[PDB]
Amino acid sequence: GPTPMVGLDSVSGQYWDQHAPLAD
């Protein structure tokens, strides 16, 4: 998903996915 990290986001192939104000 949209956050500046890596992994999890296997529904769009992107850079993290896990809600909290760096991960939203």
CB burial of residue 13 (10 Å; 0-12, 13-18, 19+)? exposed
Cα distance between residue 1 and residue 8, in whole Å:
8
Cα distance between residue 2 and residue 7, in whole Å:
11
Contact 3, 22 (CB under 8 A): yes
Measured between its terminal Cα atoms, the distance across the chain in Å is 8
Cα distance between residue 15 and residue 24, in whole Å:
11
Contact 17, 4 (CB under 8 A): no
Structure determined via: NMR
